[PDB]
Symmetry: C3
């Protein structure tokens, strides 16, 4: 049973008036790594001005030559309130992410999340998400 997900759109806003993340540490000039950014990325079920918020990407990503992400994908939907998808993986804009687990309706979830740049704005960007998850919640 594969989760029939619609493509989601994660709003990664590093700065600007709608900034939803912040760096708490800086990079060491000797090594070139160490920056840690805590993020509360908004996730929509579509594109456009009438796209609705369906989830949040709450967690952090650390810079070690590449960004290692670890965040909870908590669903703000009325019927899926409380249920979360646990995501861990490398790179934010491109690449893949791993579904390392989940809670509620997505208990014991497993799968991957494909990332694709969709829109580049002045103070942020939108990342298209394709979820190939499986939950044994028969």
């Amino acid at each position: 049973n594969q989760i029939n997900f619609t493509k989601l759109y994660l709003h990664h806003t590093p700065a600007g008036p709608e900034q939803n993340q912040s760096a708490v540490t800086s990079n060491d000039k000797k090594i070139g790594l160490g920056c840690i950014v805590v993020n509360n990325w908004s996730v929509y079920d579509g594109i456009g001005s009438d796209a609705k918020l369906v989830a949040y990407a709450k967690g952090l990503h650390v810079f070690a030559g590449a960004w290692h992400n670890s965040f909870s994908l908590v669903f703000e939907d009325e019927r899926l309130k409380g249920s979360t998808l646990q995501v861990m993986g490398l790179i934010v804009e491109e690449g893949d992410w791993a579904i390392v687990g989940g809670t509620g309706q997505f208990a014991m979830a497993t799968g991957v999340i494909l990332k694709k740049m969709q829109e580049q704005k002045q103070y942020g960007n939108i990342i298209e998400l394709t979820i190939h998850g499986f939950c044994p919640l028969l």
Copy 2:
């Protein structure tokens, strides 16, 4: 290095673990404080507080309860607290075996069992959180573990 690939099957409901009545002591302050914040929230954005936690876990409530594990990891504030810790057991019958836990919210909600080591290899499941007792220096959170161990 050497990489071997062997086709097989995975029995999801292989070994089911159902440890009930486990209570985590989340103590942000006091002499028994078992965590500490190493960053503060950004005053302009409202997030960023990273806390490193060594939460003690007991097998009951009261004076007859005994410590059975430690919740060693961290939780960061990004509108809510995103957790990531190793539930390393300390009892004799489960020494060395750990449960890797990730999920949102500390006081309530649900946590995801994303893996494990030792006797809990490849473990998947969830951990249910429920407020048990609010105290002066923190609170006790009731944990309910419902996770299987697949057989390769």
Copy 3:
């Protein structure tokens, strides 16, 4: 049952270099002297296919480890070899130089990977050490 493949890595050598000209990590927070925890280190550990000579770089351990009485790890094991370039293994667990690690996921060739990683000390150097990694995991078919 779930049809898949059991992946088994042997003789992977992780470079844990806290200091020196080849230091591959850096502490970003300090330990709280009152409680005794809180040190956070961001690590880019290199993983090789052997020791000495011209051992080919095969993977990087990109992530972080925090100190809370012990070291809790969470990182992505991204491979650099041509065949596995881009594929990752998501790893979480306690202790760096010994003990066990847990495989909580993966991408690319190791999508939906689940298993454990075994650690073992190999060479202790003045500026760091080398940890031998043995991976016993399972991946569902496609």
